[PDB]
Each structure stands twice: as C-alpha cells, then as structure tokens.
Amino acid sequence: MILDVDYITEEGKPVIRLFKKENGKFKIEHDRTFRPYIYALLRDDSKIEEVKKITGERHGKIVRIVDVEKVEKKFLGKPITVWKLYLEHPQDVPTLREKVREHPAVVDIFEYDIPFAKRYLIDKGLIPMEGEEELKILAFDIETLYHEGEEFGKGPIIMISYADENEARVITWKNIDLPYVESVSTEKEMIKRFLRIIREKDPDIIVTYNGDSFDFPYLAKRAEKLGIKLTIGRDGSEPKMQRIGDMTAVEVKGRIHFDLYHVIRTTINLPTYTLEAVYEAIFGKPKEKVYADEIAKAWESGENLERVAKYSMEDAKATYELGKEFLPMEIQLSRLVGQPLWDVSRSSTGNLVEWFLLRKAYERNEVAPNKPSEEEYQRRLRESYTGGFVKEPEKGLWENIVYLDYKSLYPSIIITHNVSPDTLNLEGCKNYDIAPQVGHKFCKDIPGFIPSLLGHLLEERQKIKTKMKETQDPIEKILLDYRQKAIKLLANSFYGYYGYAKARWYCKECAESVTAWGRKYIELVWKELEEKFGFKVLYIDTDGLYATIPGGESEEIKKKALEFVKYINSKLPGLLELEYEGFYKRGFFVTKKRYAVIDEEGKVITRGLESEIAKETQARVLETILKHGDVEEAVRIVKEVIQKLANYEIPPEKLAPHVAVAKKLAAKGVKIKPGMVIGYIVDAEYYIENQVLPAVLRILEGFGYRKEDLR
Ligand SMILES: [Mn+2]
Ligand SMILES: [Mn+2]
Numbered sequence: 226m227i228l229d230v231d232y233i234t235e236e237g238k239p240v241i242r243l244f245k246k247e248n249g250k251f252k253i254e255h256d257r258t259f260r261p262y263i264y265a266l267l268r269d270d271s272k273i274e275e276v277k278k279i280t281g282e283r284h285g286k287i288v289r290i291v292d293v294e295k296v297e298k299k300f301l302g303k304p305i306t307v308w309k310l311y312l313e314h315p316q317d318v319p320t321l322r323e324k325v326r327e328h329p330a331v332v333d334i335f336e337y338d339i340p341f342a343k344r345y346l347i348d349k350g351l352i353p354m355e356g357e358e359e360l361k362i363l364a365f366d367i368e369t370l371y372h373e374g375e376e377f378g379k380g381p382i383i384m385i386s387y388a389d390e391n392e393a394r395v396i397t398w399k400n401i402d403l404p405y406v407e408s409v410s411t412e413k414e415m416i417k418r419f420l421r422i423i424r425e426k427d428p429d430i431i432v433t434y435n436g437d438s439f440d441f442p443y444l445a446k447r448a449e450k451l452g453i454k455l456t457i458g459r460d461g462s463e464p465k466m467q468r469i470g471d472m473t474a475v476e477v478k479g480r481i482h483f484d485l486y487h488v489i490r491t492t493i494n495l496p497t498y499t500l501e502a503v504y505e506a507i508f509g510k511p512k513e514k515v516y517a518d519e520i521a522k523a524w525e526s527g528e529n530l531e532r533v534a535k536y537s538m539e540d541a542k543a544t545y546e547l548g549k550e551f552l553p554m555e556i557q558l559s560r561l562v563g564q565p566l567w568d569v570s571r572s573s574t575g576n577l578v579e580w581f582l583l584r585k586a587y588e589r590n591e592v593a594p595n596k597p598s599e600e601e602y603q604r605r606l607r608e609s610y611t612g613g614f615v616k617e618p619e620k621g622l623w624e625n626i627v628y629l630d631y632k633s634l635y636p637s638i639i640i641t642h643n644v645s646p647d648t649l650n651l652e653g654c655k656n657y658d659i660a661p662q663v664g665h666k667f668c669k670d671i672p673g674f675i676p677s678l679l680g681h682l683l684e685e686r687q688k689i690k691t692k693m694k695e696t697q698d699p700i701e702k703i704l705l706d707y708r709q710k711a712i713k714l715l716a717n718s719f720y721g722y723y724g725y726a727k728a729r730w731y732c733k734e735c736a737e738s739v740t741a742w743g744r745k746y747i748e749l750v751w752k753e754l755e756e757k758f759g760f761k762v763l764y765i766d767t768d769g770l771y772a773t774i775p776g777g778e779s780e781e782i783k784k785k786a787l788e789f790v791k792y793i794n795s796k797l798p799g800l801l802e803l804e805y806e807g808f809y810k811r812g813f814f815v816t817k818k819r820y821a822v823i824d825e826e827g828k829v830i831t832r833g834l835e836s837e838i839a840k841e842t843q844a845r846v847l848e849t850i851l852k853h854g855d856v857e858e859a860v861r862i863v864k865e866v867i868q869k870l871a872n873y874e875i876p877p878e879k880l881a882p883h884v885a886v887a888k889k890l891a892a893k894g895v896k897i898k899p900g901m902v903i904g905y906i907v908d909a910e911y912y913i914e915n916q917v918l919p920a921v922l923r924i925l926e927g928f929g930y931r932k933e934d935l936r
Contacts, residue, residue, distance in 0.1 A: 226356035228429065228481055229565045230342040232315075237286075239314045241345050244479055246358045246429060251459070251479070259345060260291070261312040264335040264592060265325055266305070270295060272330035273308065279328070281320040288317040298592045301647035302671060307335075307592070315341035335592050339583065346563055347584045353565045354556045363428035364388045364548055365419070366540035367440050368533070370519045378446030381412050383522050385419050386537040388545035389426070395537045396422075399522070399530060406534050413451055416444070420456055427459075428480060430566075432548035434500060434540075435486040441475045442466070469571055481567050485544060488551050488570055492714070504543045507550065512539065515902035553704075557711035574718045575725050581715065582730060585678055594646075594729045605726035610736055613743040618764035618814030620927060622850060623771075625779040626822060627760075627786045629750070630806040631768045633683070635720040638742045639735075640680045641799030645673030646723075646732030660738030661745045667738070675719060675730065682716040683800075743767070746801055750793060758789045764814040769806065771814065771822075783808055811851055815927040823851045837879035838912055839920035842866055846921050856928055860935065863921050867936050870913050882907040 226246040233240045239261070243254040265276065273295065281288025293310045310325070312318055318337065326334045339347075346353065365387035369380040386395040395406045396418045409415055423431070433440050441464050448455055455463040459479025467476050475482050489495075489503050496502065501512040513536060521530030559569040562577050563584045569577065586593045597605065631637070638644065642658045644667050654668030667673070672680070689709040696702050722728050723736040747765055754760050754772055760782075763771040773782055790803050797803070809830075812822025819833030829851060835843070842862070849859035869875050886905060887897045897903070908915075918932055925935075 226358045227351065227353040227565075229353070229476075229567065230346060231476075232342055232345075234314065237314065239341065241342060246356070246360070248358075251429075259349075261315040261318055261341060261344070262309055263312075263318065263322060263325075263337040264296075264298075265308040265310055266332040266335070267308055268330040268332060270306065270308070276308075276325070276328055276330055277310070279321065279324050281317060281324070283316060283320050288313070288320050290321060298590055300592050301594070302651070302674070305592070315344075333595075335595060338596065343564060343568075343580070343583075346565075347587050350563075350588070352560055352563050354559050360429040361427060362389060362430050362432060362545070362548065362552075363423065363426055364432035364434075364541055364545035365436075365440070366434065366537060366544055367443060368519075368537050368540070369443065370522055371517055378443055378450070382415065382443070382447055383519060384534070384537045385415050386541040387419070387422065388538075388541035389428075393538050393542045393545065395534050395541075397534070399526070401531055401534050403531065403534055405538055413453065416448060416451070416453055423457060430481045430483055430552075431477060432483050432485060432544060432552075434544045435484065436482070437474045437484040437486070438472070441482070470573075474567075474571055476567050481565075483548070483552065483555070483566060483570050485547055485551060488555060489547065491574065492551075492554070500540065500543050500547075503547060507547065512543065517901060553707040554711060554714070557707050558715065561711055561715060574714060575722060575728070578715065578718055578722045579727075579729060582675075582678075586674075591674065596727055596729050597731065602726050605731065605733075610724050610733060611740050613740050613767045614747055614765055615767065615817050616765050617816060618820065619761060620814070622811065622813050622854065622856065622928070623763055623773060623775075624811045624854070625777060625782050626763065626771050626773050626809045626812050627782060628771050628806040628809065629754075629769050629786070629790065630804045631746070632800075632802040632804050633717070634743055634746075634768050634801070635739050636679055636683060636716045637800045637802065638739045639719060640676050640683065641801060642738070642742060643667050643669055643673040643676045644735045644738055644742075645675045646730055646735055648673040648676070649732065649734060660734075661741045663734075663737055663741060665734045665738045675735075679716060679719060682712050686712040686716065746797065749796075750803060753793055753796070754789060757792070758785060760785070760789075764820065766818075769803075771809075771812070811854060813850065813927055815923060819923060821847070821851065821924075827852070834924055836912075836916055837881065838866075838870075838875065839917050841879060842917060843920045843924070846924060850924075860925075860930060863917070863935055866917060867913050870917070871909055873909075880906060 228244040228246055230241060230243055233242060233255075238257070241256045241259055243256070245252055245254060267273075267276075273293070277290050277293050279290050291311050291313050293308060295306070296309050297304065297306045299305060310321075312321060322334055322337045325331055336344075345351075365385065367382050368384035368386075370383055372380050384395055384397045387393065392405065395403075396409065396415050397406055398409055398411055398415050400408055407418065409418055445455055445464065457464055457480075458477050462478050464475045464477045464482070467474050474484070486498070490498055493506060495506065499514060501514045504510070504512055518529075519533065521527055521533050555566055555570055558577055559566045562569060562580045564580050583593050596602075642660075648654075648668040648671070650666050651668045654666075654670055656669040657666050658669065659666050686709055689705050689712070693702055693705045693709075696705070720736065720739060722730070723732050723739070725731065747770070751762050751765060751770065755762055760772045760774050763773065772786075774785070786805060790805055794802050807824065809822035809824050812820065814820035815833070817833075821829065821831030821834055823829045829847070831847075845862050846859045849855050849862060881904065886907070887895070890897060895901075913936065918935065922932060922935075925931075
C-alpha cells in the first residue's frame with residue numbers, strides 16, 4: 226500500500242520517496258530516474274534548436290533547460306504536437322517557464338504548475354491507499370486553561386487524551402481516581418507519555434479534529450518552551466506546518482495526519498460543526514459543551530475535574546469514532562483521484578475533480594488546459610451563471626401527494642448530450658444536439674472528454690450497487706457501499722465544476738446548457754403528467770416535483786403514478802430518468818423553498834419553515850394541519866394565544882436583551898466574555914408580534930389569512 230509521496234533534494238537533485246505500507250512492513254522507496262517538465266506549443270518545430278538555450282538563475286546558481294525531445298498529444302480532442310522540455314529540479318520550473326511563453330516561437334506552454342510528487346503518481350499511474358492492509362488508527366485531543374487573556378500557549382496543557390480500538394485514555398498531571406486516567410508528575414511527563422504512546426502504538430493514520438489549527442500547533446508552542454522535541458513522525462521528527470488553501474496544515478512524516486474537521490464540513494450541510502454538533506447528527510446520542518469551567522484546575526483546584534476528565538476521554542472517543550466513519554469516504558476519494566489522503570482530505574470537492582481530470586488526461590494522452598490567469602479568473606467571479614427551476618406552488622392543503630425524482634439529472638444530461646467544452650460548437654461536426662434555450666451546440670461524432678469519463682463513473686457505480694445486492698460478506702458490503710458513495714459524490718460535482726472559477730476545464734456554456742436542458746425535461750414531465758395522466762402538479766424543484774389528482778382516491782394515485790413513470794421514461798432520451806420517490810399523506814407548499822408534508826407513518830419533513838411560546842405554538846399549528854387536516858382548529862389555536870398573552874396567563878417558563886443581563890451575574894466573579902456558557906432568560910406587542918405571529922405567520926400566508934383578525 227501507499228501512503229504518501231514527497232521528494233527530498235540530494236544536492237541540486239530531486240528525489241521521490243514513497244511511504245509504502247507492506248505486509249506488516251513499513252517503508253521507503255526513493256526513486257531517482259524521474260524528472261520535472263512542461264510542454265511548449267510551437268510555431269515551427271524547426272525552432273527547437275533556438276528554444277533550448279534558455280537560461281535561468283536560481284538560488285545564486287544557474288538553472289537551465291535539460292533534455293528536450295518532441296512529442297504528439299491531443300488538446301480538447303484535436304491532435305496536436307508539442308515540445309516536452311524537461312528539467313532538473315521542480316524548482317527550476319517557476320524560473321524557466323516565463324522565459325518560455327515569452328519566446329516568439331512559442332504559442333503556449335502547458336502543465337507548468339503541477340506539484341512534482343503529484344505529477345509523479347499521475348505519470349507513473351500509482352494510486353494511494355490501494356491495498357487492504359489494516360491501518361492503525363489513533364486519535365487524540367488536548368485540553369488547556371484559557372488564561373485571563375489571549376496568547377495561545379501560555380495556558381498549559383491540562384490534559385491529553387487519546388483513543389482507538391481497545392481503549393481511550395487521558396493522560397494528566399493531577400490526581401483523579403479514574404480507571405482510565407493516568408496521572409504523571411508534570412506537564413513535561415504528560416507530553417512524554419503521549420510521545421511514548423504514539424511509539425508503542427505506532428499509528429499509520431493519526432486522527433484529530435481541528436488538530437491542524439489547534440491540537441498540533443498548541444503542542445508545539447508549548448514545547449518550543451519546555452525543552453522537548455515533538456518526536457512524532459516515524460523518522461523521529463516533529464510535526465511540520467505546510468501551505469495549502471490559504472489556511473495552514475500539518476503533515477507528520479511516515480504517518481497521515483487526517484484532521485476530521487475539514488472533511489465533515491462537506492457531506493452533511495450543518496448549522497455549526499462543533500464536535501458535539503457533528504457527533505449528534507451522524508449517530509444520534511448527545512454530548513456536553515461550552516467551557517472555561519476548567520476551574521477544576523485553576524486555583525480552585527476543586528474536583529469536578531472528575532467531570533472534565535470524562536469530557537476529554539470524550540473529545541477523543543468521539544473524534545476516533547467519526548474518523549473511522551468519515552475515513553473510508555476519503556480513502557475512496559483518494560483512490561479514485563490517485564493522490565494522497567493528507568492532501569485529498571484537505572481540498573474542496575471542486576478540486577478533487579480537477580485532480581480527477583489531470584489524471585484521466587494523462588491516461589488518455591490529452592494536455593491539460595491551464596488554470597485561469599488572475600484576469601480570466603477575475604471575470605468568472607462574475608456571477609449569475611443560471612440554475613433551473615424553482616416556479617411557485619399550487620397553494621393549499623393537499624392530500625395523497627406523490628413525489629417524483631430524476632435519477633441524477635445533471636450527470637445524466639452531460640452524458641446524454643455529450644456536453645463538454647471540447648464538443649462545444651466544434652467546427653464542422655456532422656451529428657449534434659442543441660441546448661434548449663441558448664442554442665449552444667454539442668457535437669456527437671465522438672464521446673466528449675468529461676462525458677465518457679462520467680459515463681464510466683456512472684457505469685461502475687451500477688456494478689457496485691448491483692454486486693452489493695448479491696453479497697453476504699458484510700465486510701465486502703460496507704466497503705462496496707463506500708466505493709459507490711464516493712463515485713457518487715464525485716459524479717455529482719461535475720456540474721459545479723464547469724462553473725468553477727479555477728476549473729482548468731471551465732466552460733460556462735457547458736454549465737448553461739445542462740441547466741437549461743434541465744428545464745426542458747422537467748417541463749415535459751410536467752406537461753405529460755398533467756395532460757396524458759390527469760394529475761394536478763403541485764410544485765416543481767430542480768430535480769423533481771409533487772403531484773396528485775385532487776380529491777383522488779389514494780392507492781390509485783400511487784398506482785397511476787407508478788404507471789406514468791414507465792410511460793415517460795420511454796419518452797425521455799438517453800439516460801434521463803424519473804423515479805417514484807415517496808408518498809405523503811398531506812402537505813402544502815407555501816412558496817419557493819418553504820413547504821411541509823407527513824408520510825403514511827406520521828413523519829414530518831419540512832424545509833423552509835421551523836422562544837418557546839412560538840416553538841410550542843408553531844407546532845400545535847403544524848400538528849392540526851398535517852396530522853388532523855384542520856386549518857380552523859389551528860387559527861382556533863393562534864387565537865386562544867394571541868389571547869393568553871393580552872390576557873397575561875402563561876407560565877414565565879417558555880420565554881428564555883443581549884448584554885443586558887451581565888447586569889447582575891457581575892456579582893459572581895462572572896467575568897463573562899463572548900465565549901462562556903449562558904442559557905439566560907429575558908412587551909405584549911412582542912410575544913404576540915415580534916414573536917408568535919411571524920412564526921405561525923409564514924405557514925399561514927399559505928392560506929391567505931393575515932396578521933389582522935388573527936390578533
Ligand atoms: Mn503527501
Ligand atoms: Mn478539546
């Protein structure tokens with residue numbers, strides 16, 4: 226197996242190193258028969274002897290242009306010949322190139338900014354995390370004392386916890402009568418246990434949580450000070466900070482520092498991403514947090530520290546557990562992409578796709594277009610591309626509603642009309658379809674670079690969804706489940722790619738035509754659904770829509786629906802396809818992205834809607850409409866409220882303005898600052914107006930009523 230790749234310089238020369246993991250062995254391969262490079266497009270290959278002499282001048286030394294044999298590739302489909310001008314060090318590159326696009330004989334230069342080790346795995350076809358070796362996973366978190374003010378690292382490290390598959394400890398330097406804490410004389414020794422531990426344990430992957438930004442550099446700052454090498458890599462070297470997106474990461478030699486944070490912050494969209502926030506969302510249970518309740522430590526070394534311990538063993542076990550979960554996704558994106566996980570982990574899906582293409586461009590012998598200049602890229606931030614539908618809803622309480630899904634509408638549009646910058650209004654094609662409203666024309670005589678790739682992603686995703694339904698090893702099954710969810714994440718992000726400012730394969734027209742092609746099928750389904758099948762369409766949304774037959778009998782609407790889906794697929798082109806998503810006993814659609822519904826089994830989904838006078842009231846409202854089908858009873862419920870408020874009869878309990886009550890807490894040494902737990906309590910025109918009404922008032926526009934009377 227592979228884990229990583231980087232290069233060292235052994236004097237004026239670059240060397241690739243491979244961290245392989247191999248049958249309980251761990252090691253290093255250095256390869257030195259590999260060299261840096263770029264392409265030059267040329268005026269007349271004849272110059273070749275003129276455009277080699279190009280000198281540089283780096284480090285107080287002379288860069289030059291080593292060996293330069295001629296090659297034949299393809300660009301956007303078109304065969305085209307060019308000059309592979311090789312080099313010596315990948316740093317000879319940033320110093321050579323400008324001299325070259327600035328030479329009269331050269332038209333363009335290409336692939337001039339690919340990091341070396343990345344260029345290495347792609348050109349040699351190597352894929353990281355490939356095997357099926359048992360990686361050793363270890364997670365850890367640390368706990369501090371946020372001093373009176375803010376330096377970062379004046380607060381000692383109160384605790385150091387860690388976790389894995391056998392246990393989860395906490396290492397600390399105070400006394401705590403717990404079976405899973407380990408006490409050690411000082412904070413110097415705490416750090417040492419930790420080091421000795423990663424030594425006995427020796428993990429291949431170390432999992433943290435915002436350890437990039439916190440756990441790791443806190444540790445460092447707090448040792449460049451206490452006289453202790455953070456001997457954490459496998460070559461017995463310390464964690465090292467590395468540049469990435471503008472923010473700043475930590476690679477750890479021989480092991481893989483995988484920082485949960487950057488990874489979660491993607492799949493499931495989330496209000497906040499506190500560990501607790503995250504830990505809940507994915508397996509339910511709950512946690513505990515908002516601190517500086519470290520009083521247990523500070524003078525006032527009162528117990529309760531027993532509490533705090535519990536919490537560290539927690540920060541970890543949680544961290545470990547999400548890691549085990551969110552990790553296979555990333556192992557897989559790394560695998561599809563052909564790059565390394567400390568890397569893969571830290572890049573937008575936008576980017577994973579780009580490496581997905583640099584790699585599929587080498588494999589099929591196609592020069593990669595260059596990234597955008599600052600200017601071409603300045604434009605792009607120019608907006609408004611164009612995304613499909615959202616038309617307004619047939620208002621009203623409806624019942625026996627049916628929801629119809631498009632099986633991956635965009636990956637499907639792209640594949641079917643061969644939408645691609647490289648098929649785009651290409652000259653003299655003989656076969657071609659035309660983008661609905663904007664006339665862009667995508668040729669059809671030849672697959673299209675992204676279309677064939679996408680088609681192949683979708684085709685391998687079916688071989689996995691299919692093999693699963695067949696498998697009894699539950700190990701193979703979850704693993705396959707992983708392969709698929711990744712291909713899926715990836716296949717689904719090409720749309721946005723086309724729209725990406727920095728995509729090398731930018732093509733806003735490819736993006737407009739999909740969106741637009743998107744509108745035409747929706748409609749069509751919408752027509753057909755209403756005309757040929759007598760349904761009233763209730764509300765369309767970018768991939769699908771809700772429908773029914775007013776007053777219609779319910780296990781008929783289902784069956785007419787079922788029926789209509791097989792009617793339509795036969796009318797839809799290539800691989801466009803609708804599917805039957807769900808049946809909801811009732812629902813109503815206020816407007817654009819506000820609406821609600823409940824299924825045959827009492828569950829309520831609502832997006833766009835949702836104090837405790839409102840909370841309790843907006844919900845009684847909801848029950849009545851959904852569960853008991855009644856609009857009156859609920860106004861009948863806003864009323865018996867707008868009136869217990871102007872009558873004044875409701876527990877002083879459902880109310881829990883800012884700033885304002887660090888107005889009495891000022892006695893308790895309660896030196897509150899914008900980061901201290903506070904679940905604090907706080908008109909008539911209020912409660913009824915700034916409060917109750919707006920929260921029951923959106924739902925209701927939906928039936929026309931209005932604040933007045935309501936009052
Ligand atoms: Mn790496
Ligand atoms: Mn923590």
